[PDB]
Design a protein around this ligand. Structure first.
Ligand code: GTP
Ligand code: SAM
Ligand code: MG
Length: 259
């Protein structure tokens, strides 16, 4: 049993009020008041982020932890926050975005955010059985939360295997992907093998809530994986009891227009 396993158990044991306060203590949170209503009413001429994912990927790019370029593939695009971010980057020439959709899953939001015309969305697509194709940048933000850490570990393992398949097709592609449950043993083993062959490392974004252990793997960074995970598990375990609120910041606005 790992520190992350203990964190998950302590999380599940919170009362409702305890969980709510812990979830957001000390986290950066974009102000989505305007964006949320525009999307709800069906406004398409908007550059405000379609989800909280946009600011997360922007942070990784602005830190130099990812370098989005060329032909990008967004595996599990959901509402499209990462696809719209990538399409706005001058170094990106095209985005192919795929998501399963259906009951309980978010379909792409359709807006004129800058570079929208460079995105090809395909909903109703399972990426785990889809054959890889050529790409310069492979992104994947898949990892559905579950109160069961063993399920979260298996979900994470499937994402890492997907990334190995895309790297097999594209050995030189840059990769950025969510690692939902990085502390599980089969996840450590799989990440170690990934890092051995492809380089990379893990990083925690400041927008990720304390109710998730998610870390992002990128081929553009480095770092001992076990040390990265345990550092994160301890920061999460130490935040239990903190009463400070979230840190509110403006939502990303990418502007509108074609590229
Ligand atoms: N103690 C407690 N734990 C909870 C509760 N709800 C969720 N959790 C735990 O927190 C984990 C993450 O919960 P969520 O924040 O809803 O997961 P998410 O993927 O971010 O969900 P979205 O907000 O829809 O994006 C769950 O897998 C549970 O382990 C709750 O009401 N009480
Ligand atoms: C919420 S999204 C990522 C958020 C996105 N990066 C953004 O910025 O809006 C994760 C998506 O992956 C989708 N997904 C999960 N499993 C999938 C699968 N096997 N194939 C395709 N899409 C999948 C889920 O429906 C979900 O919408
Ligand atoms: Mg989660």
């Amino acid at each position: 049993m790992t520190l992350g396993d203990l964190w998950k158990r302590r999380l599940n044991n919170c009362t409702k009020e305890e969980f709510f306060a812990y979830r957001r203590t000390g986290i950066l949170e974009t102000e989505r008041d305007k964006a949320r209503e525009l999307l709800r009413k069906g406004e398409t001429n908007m550059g405000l982020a379609v989800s909280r994912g946009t600011a997360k990927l922007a942070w990784l790019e602005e830190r130099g932890y990812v370098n989005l370029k060329g032909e990008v593939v967004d595996l599990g695009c959901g509402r499209g926050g990462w696809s719209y971010y990538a399409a706005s980057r001058p170094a990106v020439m095209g985005v192919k975005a795929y998501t399963i959709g259906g009951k309980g899953h978010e379909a792409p939001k359709m807006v004129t955010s800058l570079g929208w015309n460079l995105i090809k969305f395909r909903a109703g697509m399972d990426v785990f059985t889809m054959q890889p194709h050529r790409a310069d940048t492979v992104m994947c933000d898949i990892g559905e939360s579950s109160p069961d850490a063993a399920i979260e570990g298996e979900r994470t393992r499937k994402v890492i295997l997907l990334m190995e398949q895309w790297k097999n097709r594209n050995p030189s592609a840059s990769c950025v992907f969510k690692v939902l449950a990085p502390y599980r043993p089969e996840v450590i083993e799989a990440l170690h093998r990934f890092q051995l062959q492809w380089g990379g490392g893990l990083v925690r974004t400041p927008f990720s809530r304390n109710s998730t252990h998610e870390m992002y793997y990128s081929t553009a960074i480095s770092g001992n994986i076990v040390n990265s995970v345990n550092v994160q598990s301890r920061k999460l375990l130490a935040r239990f009891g903190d009463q400070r609120g979230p840190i509110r910041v403006p939502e990303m606005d990418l502007g509108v227009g074609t590229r």
